[PDB]
Design a protein around this ligand. Structure first.
Ligand SMILES: *[C@@H]1O[C@H](CO)[C@@H](O[C@@H]2O[C@H](CO)[C@@H](O)[C@H](O)[C@H]2NC(C)=O)[C@H](O)[C@H]1NC(C)=O
Ligand SMILES: *[C@@H]1O[C@H](CO)[C@@H](O[C@@H]2O[C@H](CO)[C@@H](O)[C@H](O)[C@H]2NC(C)=O)[C@H](O)[C@H]1NC(C)=O
Ligand SMILES: *[C@@H]1O[C@H](CO)[C@@H](O)[C@H](O)[C@H]1NC(C)=O
Ligand SMILES: *[C@@H]1O[C@H](CO)[C@@H](O)[C@H](O)[C@H]1NC(C)=O
Ligand SMILES: *[C@@H]1O[C@H](CO)[C@@H](O)[C@H](O)[C@H]1NC(C)=O
Lengths: 49, 48
């Protein structure tokens, strides 16, 4: 359970609907995915560690 | 509460009594005989 407040008991069951497991995909940051802009700063035409 | 585990306890034969019950975190979590089995873990406060 998430919280503990019994908001409803309407249509609740224990079925394992995810027999095919939670899907998985591989993280690839080569095109900027997973990165963010640094504060108030602009960097132009350059590589930064 | 729902989704929580009850206080870990064990019943065992001791001093010729069949069900002498013992539980975790005794005497208390600060002076526990083995902090490893106690669910309350001593922690220093993090910055902020
Ligand atoms: C969670 O709350 C619901 C109500 O919102 C409870 O369902 C009721 O349970 C009683 C038990 O005597 C019944 O008389 C009612 O007919 C039920 N339905 C409603 C709409 O009240 C439910 O028991 C609670 N607990 C759990 C674990 O679901
Ligand atoms: C972005 O930076 C690159 C690398 O400093 C610049 O590429 C050079 O551009 C000159 C012509 O202006 C060429 O003679 C070099 O051979 C280029 N080098 C490489 C590695 O490509 C590029 O001009 C810059 N672009 C802007 C708009 O500033
Ligand atoms: C649901 O089914 C999958 C596939 O058999 C299994 O890996 C998973 O452990 C099951 N979930 C539960 C909570 O039993
Ligand atoms: C230190 O703490 C452990 C765990 O409670 C205990 O087994 C041990 O006897 C203690 N040793 C001393 C010197 O107090
Ligand atoms: C508490 O949760 C951690 C994972 O975050 C797990 O390693 C540990 O065994 C848990 N302890 C208890 C008492 O549930």
């Amino acid at each position: 359970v998430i919280g503990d407040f019994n908001c409803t008991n309407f249509a609740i069951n224990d079925l394992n609907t995810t027999v095919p497991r939670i899907s998985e995909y591989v993280v690839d940051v080569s095109y900027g995915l997973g990165t963010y802009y640094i504060l108030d700063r602009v960097y132009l035409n350059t590589t930064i560690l | 509460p729902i989704g929580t585990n009850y206080r870990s306890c064990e019943s065992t034969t001791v001093l010729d009594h069949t069900d002498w019950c013992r539980c975790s975190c005794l005497p208390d979590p600060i002076t526990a005989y083995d902090p490893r089995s106690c669910s309350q873990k001593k922690s220093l406060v993090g910055v902020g």
